[PDB]
Amino acid sequence: MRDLKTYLSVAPVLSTLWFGSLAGLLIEINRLFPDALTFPFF
Amino acid sequence: DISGLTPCKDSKQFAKREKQQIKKLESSLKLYAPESAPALALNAQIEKTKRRFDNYGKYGLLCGSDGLPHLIVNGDQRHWGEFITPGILFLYIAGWIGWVGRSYLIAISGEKKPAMKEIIIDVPLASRIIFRGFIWPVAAYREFLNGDLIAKD
Amino acid sequence: KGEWLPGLASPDYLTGSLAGDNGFDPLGLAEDPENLKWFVQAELVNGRWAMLGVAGMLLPEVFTKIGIINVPEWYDAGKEQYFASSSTLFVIEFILFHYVEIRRWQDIKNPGSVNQDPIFKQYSLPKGEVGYPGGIFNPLNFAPTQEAKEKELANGRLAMLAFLGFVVQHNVTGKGPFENLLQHLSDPWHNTIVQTF
Amino acid sequence: LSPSIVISLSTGLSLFLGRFVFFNFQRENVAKQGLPEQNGKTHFEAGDDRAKEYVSLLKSNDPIGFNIVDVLAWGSIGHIVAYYILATSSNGYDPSFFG
Amino acid sequence: AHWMPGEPRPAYLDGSAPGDFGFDPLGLGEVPANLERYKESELIHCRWAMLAVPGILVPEALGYGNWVKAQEWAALPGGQATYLGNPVPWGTLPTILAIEFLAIAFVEHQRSMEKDPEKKKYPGGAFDPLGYSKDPKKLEELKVKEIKNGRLALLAFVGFCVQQSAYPGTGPLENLATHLADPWHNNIGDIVIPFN
Numbered sequence A: 001m002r003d004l005k006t007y008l009s010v011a012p013v014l015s016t017l018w019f020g021s022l023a024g025l026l027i028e029i030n031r032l033f034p035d036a037l038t039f040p041f042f
Numbered sequence B: 001d002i003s004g005l006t007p008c009k010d011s012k013q014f015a016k017r018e019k020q021q022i023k024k025l026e027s028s029l030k031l032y033a034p035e036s037a038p039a040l041a042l043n044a045q046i047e048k049t050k051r052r053f054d055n056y057g058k059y060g061l062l063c064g065s066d067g068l069p070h071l072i073v074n075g076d077q078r079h080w081g082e083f084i085t086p087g088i089l090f091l092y093i094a095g096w097i098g099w100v101g102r103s104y105l106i107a108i109s110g111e112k113k114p115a116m117k118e119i120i121i122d123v124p125l126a127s128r129i130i131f132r133g134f135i136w137p138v139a140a141y142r143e144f145l146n147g148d149l150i151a152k153d
Numbered sequence C: 001k002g003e004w005l006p007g008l009a010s011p012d013y014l015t016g017s018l019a020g021d022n023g024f025d026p027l028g029l030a031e032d033p034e035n036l037k038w039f040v041q042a043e044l045v046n047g048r049w050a051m052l053g054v055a056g057m058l059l060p061e062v063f064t065k066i067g068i069i070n071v072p073e074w075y076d077a078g079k080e081q082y083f084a085s086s087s088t089l090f091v092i093e094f095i096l097f098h099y100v101e102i103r104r105w106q107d108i109k110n111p112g113s114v115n116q117d118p119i120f121k122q123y124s125l126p127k128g129e130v131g132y133p134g135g136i137f138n139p140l141n142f143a144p145t146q147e148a149k150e151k152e153l154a155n156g157r158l159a160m161l162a163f164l165g166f167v168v169q170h171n172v173t174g175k176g177p178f179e180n181l182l183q184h185l186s187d188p189w190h191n192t193i194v195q196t197f
Numbered sequence D: 001l002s003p004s005i006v007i008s009l010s011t012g013l014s015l016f017l018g019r020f021v022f023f024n025f026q027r028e029n030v031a032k033q034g035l036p037e038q039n040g041k042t043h044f045e046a047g048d049d050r051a052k053e054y055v056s057l058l059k060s061n062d063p064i065g066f067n068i069v070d071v072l073a074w075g076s077i078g079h080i081v082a083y084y085i086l087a088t089s090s091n092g093y094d095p096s097f098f099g
Numbered sequence E: 001a002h003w004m005p006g007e008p009r010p011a012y013l014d015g016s017a018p019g020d021f022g023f024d025p026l027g028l029g030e031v032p033a034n035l036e037r038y039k040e041s042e043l044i045h046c047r048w049a050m051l052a053v054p055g056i057l058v059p060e061a062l063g064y065g066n067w068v069k070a071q072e073w074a075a076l077p078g079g080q081a082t083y084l085g086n087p088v089p090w091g092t093l094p095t096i097l098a099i100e101f102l103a104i105a106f107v108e109h110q111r112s113m114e115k116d117p118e119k120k121k122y123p124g125g126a127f128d129p130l131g132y133s134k135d136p137k138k139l140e141e142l143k144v145k146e147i148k149n150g151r152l153a154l155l156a157f158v159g160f161c162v163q164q165s166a167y168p169g170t171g172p173l174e175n176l177a178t179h180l181a182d183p184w185h186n187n188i189g190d191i192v193i194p195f196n
């Protein structure tokens, strides 16, 4: 869709998409590996 | 045993903190039916607490007189996992970001009005530039040696 | 010379002149030519050392299992007791590696700089290209044709990933490489990475 | 060594260094620094009528140019080093390094 | 003549000076007056260190010391130097410091007042008996020999000091004896790589 990809390219729409994806990533990581205080995998 | 701290698997105050939190959760678990959903969530939190304290036991965390895991960030190998192995894992990821957003800014630096790509991010160009920063440390190293890291005004 | 992803074009900095030039630079590392001629050398040396490493941590194991000669499995090979200390080896491997690697450094800085002996000034080295010294590094005198250089870089790129596979097949498996191969050939559909995790 | 001997020897060996050994170096450094310069001019040249370098106290005769101020300087160093010797010797202190 | 073949030579290090192998990475001798000062101080450090190496090895072979044992007597109040067993009657700490100061200050400050930069390093005359200066075709060779043996002695003094730092209570000939007894397992490797 022309000019919708330009709107979704705009800084707030793109920032909310990036930070929603990133926050879901961090959230699911903390579900998978909750309560982390060390990196023991070396 | 550095800095006068007993390990957390051996610290009596750490186990006392575990037992205190577990009793605090169990006193909230009595008010619900043993098969009900709040009770199951509380039990899941109880196992989460127990394995959290076990994992802080096994990962070499040191506990003080207050009985809380202290982080030895000096450089002792036994505790690199507390600060340095995460810290590098930060400086990588952080240096990914800055090496991406910098590179993007160099790729849209030669446009006519380069400010309308700051607010409207070229997703194809940004996606091409994002993984350039995967192995960013060698690019930053070489650009420091080639002088392309510092503008010459 | 060929292409690694046919949908993609070889970049302008990889003209096909170099050996092993399949156009693999998706992350634009060898975009500056100085970085390109430095990473050629880094590839060659990491690949040659990886070939020697893989040949020195696998061939011991395929000879240990069949019983031709019993030797340790490359991770219990450090703790064995040798005629020197655990650090004396590091001292020697510093003294007479600093000398050979700094001379290689002076070669990959300016090519024709370091080719004659300090002591026996007559026994020079022929003017070969950078990363390919020749001379006493070529006693059998097999020619350094471009096909041979491509074969070198291919076996080296393969040995690098082989060493990485060894490190990760001892980090999250615990066993040796060839034992993992026999475990795969025992039941391939049940002895893979997606059963260990 | 009696303290009078210590004071006399250290003072003599201080103004001996000052008269013969460390004279030309001290005096050439003096001529190099010269005077305190307030805005190019000296303190007396700029005014203030009190920072005049005294010459009635520095004119004293010597083939090399030793003055009473150098006698005070080499000799203050003398008495100082002498009392350092005397106190450091009279204090029965054990450094006890490595043991 | 180059400390590292392939590295470019500094334009102020031509090779004419004795021991001029072009070693100036940090760029210290770029201005010529500092370079003359550095040459004088190099030769002074060299001559002192290479006089010191006999004064460290010889009294440890036969003098019954280990080049730091010759200093411990002054660290303890009451006790004087054992110059080849016999005690010296010239006092113990303060008066030897007085004689050292009053002698070497005079010597080094009559050295300081020299203005000719060649006599500032190579005075000659009273300091050149036996006439080993009347033929520059060999005097340049001898200056290179002085510089080379002196740089070797400076590195050997680093060896003395750091073998003293790593092993606190020994001497260099004891280190060489340990290396001749068991050369592999008793080298530097146990210190650059400390086991704990």
Ligand code: CLA
Pocket (backbone or CB within 6 Å): A026, A029, A030, A034, A035, A036, A037, A038, B092, B093
């Ligand atoms: C700046 C200060 C600071 C610091 C150092 C920390 C540090 C931490 N906090 Mg705290 N926190 C902070 C501020 C801070 N926080 C603030 C301001 C708040 C309020 C908003 C909180 C609220 C908070 C809560 C409520 C919790 C934490 C938790 C944590 C832990 C995170 C565990 C985790 O999920 O990471 C795991 C690691 C990641 C998410 C990073 C993953 C990155 C991706 C996957 C890429 C990595 C791979 C990459 C490709 C490289 C691989 C190498 C190679 C193969 C290429 C950690 C100890 C949690 C915890 O466990 O408590 C201790 C937790 O429950 N924090």
Ligand SMILES: CC(/C=C/C=C(C)/C=C/[C@@]12O[C@]1(C)C[C@@H](O)CC2(C)C)=C\C=C\C=C(C)\C=C\C=C(C)\C=C\[C@@]12O[C@]1(C)C[C@@H](O)CC2(C)C
Pocket (backbone or CB within 6 Å): B135, C024, C025, C026, C027, C028, C029, C045, C046, C047, C049, C050, C051, C052, C053, C054, C055, C056, C057, C073, C074, C075, C077, C078, C160, C161, C163, C164
């Ligand atoms: C040198 C080397 C290994 C050397 C091993 C040696 C000496 C082993 C020695 C031993 O075993 C023995 C003999 C015996 C044991 O007793 C002792 C030890 C000591 C254990 C490995 C390099 C190993 C190097 C590896 C694995 C590198 C992988 C790099 C990759 C995949 C790069 C990918 C890219 O960079 C490109 C190509 C282009 C970019 O544009 C895009 C991306 C994608 C970023």
Ligand SMILES: CC1=C(/C=C/C(C)=C/C=C/C(C)=C/C=C/C=C(C)/C=C/C=C(C)/C=C/C2=C(C)CCCC2(C)C)C(C)(C)CCC1
Pocket (backbone or CB within 6 Å): D011, D015, D071, D072, D073, D074, D075, D076, D077, D078, D079, D080, D081, D083
């Ligand atoms: C003339 C002459 C002569 C002689 C001379 C003389 C002899 C001189 C002397 C001089 C002197 C003799 C001087 C002195 C000086 C001194 C001084 C100047 C001092 C000072 C002091 C001080 C400063 C102090 C301080 C202190 C105190 C107070 C105490 C406490 C401590 C102290 C130390 C801190 C003759 C004969 C040769 C010849 C002719 C000429």
Ligand SMILES: CCCCCCCCCCCCO[C@H]1O[C@H](CO)[C@@H](O[C@H]2O[C@H](CO)[C@@H](O)[C@H](O)[C@H]2O)[C@H](O)[C@H]1O
Pocket (backbone or CB within 6 Å): B001, B002, B003, E196
């Ligand atoms: C600006 C940055 C540069 C300037 C600062 C550099 C300082 C770097 C400090 C590195 C010191 C490394 O040495 C450090 O490790 C030794 C062991 O490994 C430790 O040794 C100590 O370990 C135990 C700690 O509980 C003690 O009970 C032991 O008595 C002692 O052996 C010391 O804590 C320290 O000596």
